[PDB]
Fold this protein.
Amino acid sequence: SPGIWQLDCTHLEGKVILVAVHVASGYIEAEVIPAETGQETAYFLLKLAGRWPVKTVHTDNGSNFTSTTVKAACWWAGIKQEDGIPYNPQSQGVIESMNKELKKIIGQVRDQAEHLKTAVQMAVFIHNHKRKGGYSAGERIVDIIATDIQTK
């Protein structure tokens, strides 16, 4: 699954945090937006796809799945837009745990940052660099993709 991502939208401080998770590694990208709209989601996906080789995005909700603006960005960037239905139920729990983790890190840094957007990027950094078990998510994503490029 080198190219499979899942969108996730969580809320803090009356603001919206939009997250893209690379499912196979746990690596994330995130941004703060005032509200989840098709236009914001579309722009976020265009940024993501310019940075990583995004084949498929599991959308976070039916509004973003339906959105013509999101569909246009997915067309532009060559992304297969999919639903995010948890046919495997462990998905909903894993995303929930990651949201809890991110909010925990935001709290741990929140006071080093005036603006939530700074705290969120600090949380992204800490999440992606954290060693588990021990590789980080940042190491895993690069390994997965590099192996894909060489295999094919």
